[PDB]
Amino acid sequence: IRPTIGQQMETGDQRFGDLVFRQLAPNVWQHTSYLDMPGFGAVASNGLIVRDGGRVLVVDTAWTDDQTAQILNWIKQEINLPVALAVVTHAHQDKMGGMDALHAAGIATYANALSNQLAPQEGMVAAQHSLTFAANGWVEPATAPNFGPLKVFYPGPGHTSDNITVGIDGTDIAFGGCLIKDSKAKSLGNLGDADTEHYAASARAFGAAFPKASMIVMSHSAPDSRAAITHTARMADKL
C-alpha cells in the first residue's frame, strides 16, 4: 500500500514527530511546530512547504533546529525531492530558530536584509542571502533569484520592523506570517517588537499586494479567508 502524500492527506492533518502538517493545495503544505511554555499551552507557529516541480521550497523554519530537522525528515519521507531554498519572514525564534538545520542540509536561505542585521544579536543565525525591497514593497527581482512561484512583499513595519510576506503564484494562497491573525482573533499576540503606528497600514498593504489570494495563511492562526486582513487592521487601529 503506497499512496502519495496527497492521497494520505485526504484523511486530514497528519501528526509527524512533534509537528503537524496540513495540505492546503496539491503542492502546498502548512508546517506547524510548538514552543513548550512550561505550565501553559504550547505556542503554535505555522510556515509553508511548496513542491515546485522537481524541488521543494520552504517558508519559515520551526522554533528550533531539531523541529526544523523534523520538517526536513517529513519532506524526505513524504515528498522525496531536494529542498532548494527557504525564505524566512523575520528575526523571531518561530521564523528563524532553525536556520542551522537548513544550512547543514545545503538549503540556500533568504531573508529581508534587515532580518539578517537583527538576528545574530538575538542568538540566531542570519540567512545566507539578503532581500532588498523597492519603495513599493516588491522584492527587487535581482535579490530573489529562481524563487519559482514565491512572490515576496514587504508590507511595511507592523508585527516587527522587518516582517515580510509571500504569495504563491498559481494558487489562492498568500502567507501573511505573523502580521495577520484570523478573523475571530481576540488579540494580535505579542506586540513587544511591533510598530504600533504603522501596523494597520501594513496589514492593508499586504491585502492590496495579493488581491486574488482567497486563502490567507498565518503564523499564529489557522488559514482563513480575506476578512482576516481587515479584522487584523481593525485590531491594530490606533494602538
**Which 3 state secondary structure label does DSSP give 66?**
helix
92 binds ligand OH (CB under 6 A): yes
Residue from 116, 219, 221, 232 binding Zn ion (CB under 5 A): 219
Q: How far apart are CA 45 and CA 220, in angstroms?
A: 5
Shortest Å, Cβ 163 to Zn ion: 7
Give the integer Cα–Cα distance in Å for 219 and 45: 5
CB of 52 to ligand OH, least distance (A): 26
Q: Which of residues 165-184 bind Zn ion (CB under 5 A)?
A: 178
Binding-site size, ligand OH (CB under 6 A): 3
User: For residues 94 and 162, which CB has a smaller minimum distance to ligand OH in the complex?
Assistant: 94
By CB under 5 A, the residues from 64 to 103 that bind Zn ion are 92, 94
Please report, for residues 10, 111, 184, 201, 239, the alpha-carbon distance to residue 230 in angstroms, rounded to integers and kept in the order given. Answer: 31, 26, 11, 10, 15
**Interface pick for ligand OH out of 178, 203, 213, 233 (rule CB under 6 A):** 178
Question: Is 195 near ligand OH (CB under 6 A)?
Answer: no
Query: Which residue numbers belong to the known binding site for Zn(2+)?
Result: 90, 92, 94, 159, 178, 220
Pick the closer one to ligand OH by CB: 65 or 94: 94
Phi/psi at 130 (5° precision): -110, 130
User: Where does residue 136 fall: left (phi above 0), alpha (psi -120 to 50 degrees), or beta otherwise?
Assistant: alpha
Taking phi over 0 as left and psi of -120 to 50 as alpha, with beta for the rest, 131 belongs to beta
What residue ranges bind ligand OH (CB under 6 A)?
Answer: 92, 94, 178
